């Protein structure tokens, strides 16, 4: 649920710097734009790339179908919150809420993150939220919020000990050290 968007960051960097590539770099990007219904990510690229012709109804019926898919979960929570449980509601909404912000911008994600940080009693979903901050940190090349949650996750992880997520973080700090200049 990341690499389809990560390769989009790859193609946006592939389109931005060279102005000589006007074919295979826009084609794969539209190939990933017609799917997953990426909405806000392509506006910043629409200003740099061509303005067509027409997008309009093609992506307007998709963002309205995405808002019907959004409002059907938003209409599922208040029927779900009538009943009650432990996390069975608030965790049901957040995953698709961060996917719904995967459609566009940082908003629904940033509210969903501070929402779910007070829900989970374990680091399982917490660090998953952190991974969402890292992938978006690569898309918008924003290193501000990725240095924080990582520092906070290392303390909950090593209290403590881990295998998969630990060796994952070992690669994450390598991606940040290679984003900036750190060789050792």
């Amino acid at each position: 649920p990341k690499n389809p968007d990560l390769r989009i960051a790859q193609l946006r960097f592939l389109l931005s710097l060279p102005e000589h590539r006007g074919d295979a770099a826009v084609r794969d990007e539209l190939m990933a734009a017609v799917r997953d219904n990426n909405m806000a990510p392509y506006y910043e690229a629409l200003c740099k790339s061509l303005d067509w012709q027409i997008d309009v109804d093609l992506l307007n019926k998709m963002k309205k179908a995405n808002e019907d898919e959004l409002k059907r979960l938003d209409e599922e929570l208040e029927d779900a919150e009538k009943n009650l449980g432990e996390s069975e509601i608030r965790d049901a909404m957040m995953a698709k809420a961060e996917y719904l912000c995967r459609i566009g911008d940082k908003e629904g994600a940033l509210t969903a993150f501070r929402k779910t940080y007070d829900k989970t009693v374990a680091l399982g979903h917490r660090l998953d939220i952190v991974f969402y901050l890292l992938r978006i940190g690569l898309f918008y090349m924003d290193n501000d919020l990725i240095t924080r949650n990582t520092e906070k996750a290392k303390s909950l992880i090593e209290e403590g000990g881990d295998w998969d997520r630990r060796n994952r973080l070992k690669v994450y700090q390598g991606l940040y050290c290679v984003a900036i200049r750190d060789f050792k």
Binding site: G161, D162, W163, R166
Partner: protein
């Protein structure tokens, strides 16, 4: 002011330098008990970090039973 430490009180420590009686060459029969005890005693005592590497918390609990023998 507090205890240095440590000047006790009681027991005391040491007293074992002029001892013990004999080395381990005596009992060679078990060999399955020593593999448990050695790994549960001298290995965690020599390298504390090696356990943290692999992510296994070494216990301090050693229980013995069965006599006789």
């Amino acid at each position: 002011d507090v205890l240095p430490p440590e000047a006790d009180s009681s027991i005391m420590m040491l007293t074992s330098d002029q001892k013990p009686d004999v080395m381990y060459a005596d009992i060679g029969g078990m060999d399955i008990q020593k593999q448990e005890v050695r790994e549960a005693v001298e290995l965690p005592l020599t390298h504390f970090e090696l356990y943290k590497q692999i992510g296994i918390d070494p216990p301090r609990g050693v229980l013995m039973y069965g006599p006789p023998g």
